[PDB]
Amino acid sequence: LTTISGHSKDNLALLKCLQGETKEKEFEISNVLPNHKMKEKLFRENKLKIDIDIEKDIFNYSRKNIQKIEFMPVNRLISQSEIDGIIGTLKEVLPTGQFTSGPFSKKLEEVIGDYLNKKYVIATSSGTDALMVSLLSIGIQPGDEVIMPANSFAATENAVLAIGAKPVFVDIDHKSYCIDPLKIEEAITQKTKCILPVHLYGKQCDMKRIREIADVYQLRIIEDACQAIGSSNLGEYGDIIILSFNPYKNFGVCGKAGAIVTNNENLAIRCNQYSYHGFEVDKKNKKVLDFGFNSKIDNLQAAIGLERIKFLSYNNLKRVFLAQRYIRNLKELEDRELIKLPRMTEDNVWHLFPIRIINGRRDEVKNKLYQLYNIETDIYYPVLSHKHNTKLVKKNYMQDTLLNTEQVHKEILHLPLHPNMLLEEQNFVLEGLINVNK
Amino acid sequence: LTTISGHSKDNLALLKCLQGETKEKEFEISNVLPNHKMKEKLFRENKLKIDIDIEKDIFNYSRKNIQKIEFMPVNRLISQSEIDGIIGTLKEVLPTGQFTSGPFSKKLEEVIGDYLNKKYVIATSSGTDALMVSLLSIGIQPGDEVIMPANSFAATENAVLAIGAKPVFVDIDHKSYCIDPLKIEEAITQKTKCILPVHLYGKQCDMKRIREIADVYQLRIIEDACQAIGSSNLGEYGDIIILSFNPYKNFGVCGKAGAIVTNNENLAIRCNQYSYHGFEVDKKNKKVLDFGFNSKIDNLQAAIGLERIKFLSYNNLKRVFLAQRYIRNLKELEDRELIKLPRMTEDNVWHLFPIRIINGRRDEVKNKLYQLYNIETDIYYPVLSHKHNTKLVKKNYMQDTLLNTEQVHKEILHLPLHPNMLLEEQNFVLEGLINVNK
Ligand SMILES: *Cc1c(COP(=O)(O)O)cnc(C)c1O
Ligand SMILES: *Cc1c(COP(=O)(O)O)cnc(C)c1O
Numbered sequence: 001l002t003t004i005s006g007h008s009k010d011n012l013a014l015l016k017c018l019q020g021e022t023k024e025k026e027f028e029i030s031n032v033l034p035n036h037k038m039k040e041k042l043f044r045e046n047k048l049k050i051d052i053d054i055e056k057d058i059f060n061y062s063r064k065n066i067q068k069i070e071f072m073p074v075n076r077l078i079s080q081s082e083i084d085g086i087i088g089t090l091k092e093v094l095p096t097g098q099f100t101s102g103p104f105s106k107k108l109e110e111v112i113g114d115y116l117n118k119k120y121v122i123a124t125s126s127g128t129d130a131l132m133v134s135l136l137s138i139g140i141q142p143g144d145e146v147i148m149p150a151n152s153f154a155a156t157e158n159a160v161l162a163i164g165a166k167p168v169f170v171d172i173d174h175k176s177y178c179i180d181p182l183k184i185e186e187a188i189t190q191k192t193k194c195i196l197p198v199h200l201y202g203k204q205c206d207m208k209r210i211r212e213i214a215d216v217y218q219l220r221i222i223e224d225a226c227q228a229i230g231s232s233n234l235g236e237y238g239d240i241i242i243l244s245f246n247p248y249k250n251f252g253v254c255g256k257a258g259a260i261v262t263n264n265e266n267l268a269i270r271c272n273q274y275s276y277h278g279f280e281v282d283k284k285n286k287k288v289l290d291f292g293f294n295s296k297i298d299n300l301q302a303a304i305g306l307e308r309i310k311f312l313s314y315n316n317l318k319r320v321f322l323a324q325r326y327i328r329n330l331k332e333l334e335d336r337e338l339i340k341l342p343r344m345t346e347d348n349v350w351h352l353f354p355i356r357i358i359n360g361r362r363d364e365v366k367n368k369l370y371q372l373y374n375i376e377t378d379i380y381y382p383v384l385s386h387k388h389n390t391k392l393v394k395k396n397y398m399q400d401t402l403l404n405t406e407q408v409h410k411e412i413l414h415l416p417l418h419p420n421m422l423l424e425e426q427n428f429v430l431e432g433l434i435n436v437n438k
Numbered sequence: 439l440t441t442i443s444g445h446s447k448d449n450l451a452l453l454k455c456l457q458g459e460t461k462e463k464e465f466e467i468s469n470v471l472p473n474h475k476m477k478e479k480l481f482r483e484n485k486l487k488i489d490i491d492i493e494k495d496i497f498n499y500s501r502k503n504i505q506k507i508e509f510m511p512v513n514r515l516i517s518q519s520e521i522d523g524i525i526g527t528l529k530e531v532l533p534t535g536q537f538t539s540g541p542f543s544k545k546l547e548e549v550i551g552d553y554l555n556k557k558y559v560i561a562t563s564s565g566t567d568a569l570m571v572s573l574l575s576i577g578i579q580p581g582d583e584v585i586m587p588a589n590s591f592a593a594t595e596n597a598v599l600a601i602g603a604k605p606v607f608v609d610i611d612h613k614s615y616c617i618d619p620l621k622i623e624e625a626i627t628q629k630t631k632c633i634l635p636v637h638l639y640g641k642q643c644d645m646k647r648i649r650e651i652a653d654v655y656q657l658r659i660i661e662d663a664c665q666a667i668g669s670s671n672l673g674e675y676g677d678i679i680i681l682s683f684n685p686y687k688n689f690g691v692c693g694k695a696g697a698i699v700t701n702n703e704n705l706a707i708r709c710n711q712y713s714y715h716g717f718e719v720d721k722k723n724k725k726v727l728d729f730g731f732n733s734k735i736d737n738l739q740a741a742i743g744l745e746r747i748k749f750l751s752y753n754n755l756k757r758v759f760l761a762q763r764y765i766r767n768l769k770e771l772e773d774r775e776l777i778k779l780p781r782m783t784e785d786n787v788w789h790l791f792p793i794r795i796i797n798g799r800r801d802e803v804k805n806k807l808y809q810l811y812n813i814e815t816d817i818y819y820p821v822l823s824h825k826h827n828t829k830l831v832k833k834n835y836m837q838d839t840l841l842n843t844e845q846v847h848k849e850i851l852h853l854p855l856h857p858n859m860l861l862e863e864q865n866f867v868l869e870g871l872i873n874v875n876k
């Protein structure tokens with residue numbers, strides 16, 4: 001038996017079974033809220049349905065004619081089932097008038113804490129705000145230094161900059177796009193207070209070694225897990241874990257929201273206080289901290305969150321199926337040394353699907369795929385943090401050289417992958433990818 | 439001929455006309471979105487309805503016996519008609535998948551811009567965020583001093599403190615609870631860069647004099663108008679006007695939102711950039727400012743705002759009626775010398791109703807209305823900015839004494855006032871207040 005908890009490791013186990021590679025594995029599903037859709041869709045009397053065809057039942061394969069591919073059409077991220085359920089919960093929340101704090105905010109924090117196996121959760125107004133509050137709660141002061149990679153979304157460095165701290169950029173691992181633990185200790189000075197690893201594209205960093213370093217220098221760890229919800233054993237070594245529930249993440253609400261996650265009650269208390277004006281917990285208009293933000297989640301978005309999180313494990317399952325299909329159908333382009341593919345691992349939730357186009361062919365392939373084959377691809381993110389055309393960069397990061405980050409930035413390309421894409425759509429992408437690499 | 443544009447002055451004129459003070463005045467209504475409910479309820483064929491009974495048609499007065507009064511029951515602040523329209527609009531927005539930016543954000547900014555007669559509006563994720571971003575856009579750096587009053591909600595000073603600037607408190611005048619223009623000049627230094635007047639409780643500060651002072655020293659003015667939507671001529675003299683649409687304000691959404699309002703195109707662009715990660719507008723992932731926040735309004739809350747703002751002018755008219763009835767019915771306590779009441783003025787939108795309990799009986803009155811008469815009263819706000827139990831206040835605001843502010847703080851008490859309260863409920867408050875002073 002394996003008991004599907006809704007995390008990446010179990011989903012990868014379930015996928016190989018749904019394709020039949022299992023050894024008569026008894027699967028059962030935990031009835032937690034992130035499994036709600038999966039349990040309705042694939043299970044029947046707490047056992048896998050006998051009659052599951054992935055292509056027909058899960059992806060609705062019907063040989064539809066495809067003429068163009070967009071990378072992330074927003075209208076396909078939400079399903080009619082989601083919408084009907086959201087309307088239902090809004091009709092319950094709206095009459096209450098509780099539109100700031102509320103019971104749905106607290107229910108979502110309980111759900112997230114259970115899902116992540118962490119004691120304390122502060123649901124926030126965005127992942128960016130969660131990070132800012134979290135930096136403040138560990139005691140970050142203006143001029144303090146925060147070690148971080150240079151290839152994240154701008155929010156990561158912005159949270160550090162917004163409170164007057166100093167990003168110190170460290171090179172990545174070319175094997176995982178994650179910050180390299182072997183280069184972290186070199187960057188530690190008297191001014192560093194925090195290491196800020198990013199679980200980029202849905203894959204986790206090598207957190208075990210970072211913790212060992214963090215303990216020797218007595219540094220805090222705040223993990224940017226804004227793209228990594230559902231990854232197994234997420235946050236085992238972190239002081240604080242940051243989540244984002246923006247509508248584009250593996251799990252989103254209908255608007256902006258995020259969360260702070262921790263087992264450390266002292267940090268949890270300060271985060272709750274900083275996220276709401278410095279007021280003592282649930283003592284509005286009475287400050288104990290010097291200041292704070294207006295950064296807790298909306299009760300209404302928490303209620304939408306509790307409806308949409310029902311689809312999380314199922315949508316992550318569709319994501320891992322799509323990623324494996326890309327890997328298996330592009331392998332010969334890798335054997336020809338034209339591209340490098342990601343490897344299937346049990347922690348990746350496949351928020352984004354990166355490949356590397358080597359021999360300097362990335363720009364030609366991206367541009368031809370769009371201009372010739374009507375296929376959008378994207379580069380997350382087009383500019384590295386030490387390379388923005390800002391006054392901050394020109395004064396502080398001109399001499400920054402991040403060898404692996406910069407090299408892989410010239411090769412990276414992200415392929416369309418979202419849980420409601422058709423297999424005919426992925427076929428379109430796959431054939432363009434193959435045709436342009438003849 | 440009086441043209442009702444949905445603002446303060448005309449509402450006071452209309453109220454005088456709707457009562458026995460009419461002067462055969464002809465009223466017309468402008469079909470703007472904030473007038474929607476007003477026009478539907480009080481007008482017919484584009485003329486004022488003939489036999490409007492304020493108590494019976496607007497408040498449904500039936501002498502229902504009341505046993506208890508809550509200060510601000512959140513369930514009573516939103517109507518079923520609003521809920522219906524919200525459900526209706528969300529069935530249209532939700533299928534678009536457009537949950538961050540979107541067309542409703544843009545429409546709400548046009549609507550607010552028209553209503554305030556200002557060229558540029560950036561809809562934000564909160565009033566607090568709007569204030570922080572505006573301060574950034576005028577160039578506030580760490581160390582710049584911001585002249586404020588000390589009697590505002592924490593957010594006003596928190597926005598200054600959050601970006602490293604230093605608030606410079608200035609006393610109020612005893613007449614309006616607003617910053618005393620007489621004392622602005624006293625506090626101006628080489629380091630002052632902005633004056634931050636607060637239109638507290640819905641009453642406008644004497645802005646014409648503040649503009650005079652600010653121009654002598656070439657200072658920007660940022661108006662915290664988070665309590666004052668609908669006040670006539672709002673922002674005539676300020677560089678930027680901060681609005682809040684939090685759900686307990688005269689107009690609110692069903693979550694957090696705000697707006698930045700300006701005629702200055704250069705500030706609006708910077709506000710737009712600081713509002714979304716420092717990115718150039720419509721060119722994401724390419725930064726032009728050093729950093730930014732994630733603080734634009736959610737498209738979903740903008741759709742909601744466009745539904746709820748239909749009630750604003752009508753809900754402000756119920757507020758003024760309530761205010762006047764408290765005034766006329768409590769003056770027996772004013773003539774006695776036990777209390778002091780606000781004066782009806784054309785600019786007050788009556789977000790809160792303040793009175794002053796004289797000669798040190800405020801605490802006993804407040805506590806006996808609750809234990810003896812089950813009447814909730816509240817103090818907005820319980821702690822002054824310079825007296826909080828924070829490390830800031832003792833290290834910073836220890837020699838700081840603000841005479842009229844602190845003395846008024848011992849007298850102040852707010853009476854329940856919200857546009858859906860019953861007159862039976864207000865009469866219950868009035869009998870408790872007279873009884874407790876017999
Ligand atoms: C999206 C994202 C963020 C910010 O999350 P928001 O909820 O949009 O503010 C931070 N870090 C990473 C890696 C992200 O992908
Ligand atoms: C409510 C309020 C704020 C903050 O507004 P939010 O939208 O809640 O962030 C700021 N100033 C005053 C005077 C307020 O009443």
Ligand SMILES: O=C(O)CCCC(=O)O
Nearest residue numbers: 100510591684685686687
């Ligand atoms: O912060 C809040 O939720 C309340 C502010 C608005 C008000 O009640 O005056």
